Design a protein around this motif. Structure first.
Motif, PDB file in Angstrom:
ATOM      1  N   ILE A   1     -94.882  48.784 -13.665  1.00 20.73           N
ATOM      2  CA  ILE A   1     -93.537  50.228 -13.808  1.00 20.73           C
ATOM      3  C   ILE A   1     -92.370  49.978 -12.833  1.00 20.73           C
ATOM      4  O   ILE A   1     -91.614  50.541 -13.511  1.00 20.73           O
TER       5      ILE A   1
ATOM      6  N   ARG B   1     -89.236  47.414 -13.792  1.00 24.17           N
ATOM      7  CA  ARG B   1     -89.190  47.880 -15.350  1.00 24.17           C
ATOM      8  C   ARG B   1     -88.012  49.367 -15.023  1.00 24.17           C
ATOM      9  O   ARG B   1     -87.002  49.407 -15.404  1.00 24.17           O
TER      10      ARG B   1
ATOM     11  N   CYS C   1     -87.509  58.802 -16.952  1.00 20.79           N
ATOM     12  CA  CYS C   1     -88.220  58.009 -17.351  1.00 20.79           C
ATOM     13  C   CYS C   1     -88.440  57.540 -18.794  1.00 20.79           C
ATOM     14  O   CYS C   1     -88.454  56.829 -18.517  1.00 20.79           O
ATOM     15  N   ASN C   2     -88.868  58.962 -19.279  1.00 22.10           N
ATOM     16  CA  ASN C   2     -88.979  58.919 -20.685  1.00 22.10           C
ATOM     17  C   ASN C   2     -88.201  57.781 -21.339  1.00 22.10           C
ATOM     18  O   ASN C   2     -88.302  57.260 -22.550  1.00 22.10           O
TER      19      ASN C   2
ATOM     20  N   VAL D   1     -87.137  53.876 -18.764  1.00 23.08           N
ATOM     21  CA  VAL D   1     -88.289  53.267 -18.721  1.00 23.08           C
ATOM     22  C   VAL D   1     -89.024  52.683 -20.045  1.00 23.08           C
ATOM     23  O   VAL D   1     -89.484  52.638 -20.759  1.00 23.08           O
ATOM     24  N   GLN D   2     -89.946  53.597 -20.176  1.00 23.79           N
ATOM     25  CA  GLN D   2     -90.742  53.679 -21.008  1.00 23.79           C
ATOM     26  C   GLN D   2     -91.813  55.200 -20.918  1.00 23.79           C
ATOM     27  O   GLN D   2     -91.293  56.182 -19.627  1.00 23.79           O
TER      28      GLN D   2
ATOM     29  N   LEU E   1     -94.088  57.765 -19.907  1.00 21.51           N
ATOM     30  CA  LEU E   1     -95.621  57.230 -19.242  1.00 21.51           C
ATOM     31  C   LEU E   1     -97.216  58.561 -20.111  1.00 21.51           C
ATOM     32  O   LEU E   1     -96.435  59.402 -19.500  1.00 21.51           O
TER      33      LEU E   1
END
Length: 86
Positions: free
Chosen positions: A8, A11, A47-48, A51-52, A54
């Motif tokens: 994570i 990324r 982050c959403n 990145v992803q 979570l």
């Protein structure tokens, strides 16, 4: 374990170096009072998008690796300095 957390982080490193200017603008738009911080939930929203999405467990562990101040807020210039380094 620790490897999931490191994946994570890698990324996150890639997202900050690839979209430095857009991520800085997102921090600045959340930081209306120019305190050099943003909230935990605002960082998760970034982050959403970048990145992803979570899970609560993954986000808790990511937050543990972030430069967080005594008021539970993200020190985003410190974050930008660490995650934009080559």
């Amino acid at each position: 374990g620790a490897t999931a957390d490191r994946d994570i982080l890698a990324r996150l490193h890639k997202a900050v170096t690839s979209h430095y200017h857009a991520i800085t603008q997102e921090f600045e738009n959340f930081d209306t009072m120019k305190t050099n911080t943003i909230s935990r939930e605002e960082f998760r929203a970034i982050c959403n998008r970048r990145v992803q999405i979570l899970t609560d467990e993954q986000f808790g562990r990511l937050w543990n690796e972030m430069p967080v101040n005594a008021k539970g807020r993200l020190k985003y210039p410190d974050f930008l300095s660490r995650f934009s380094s080559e």
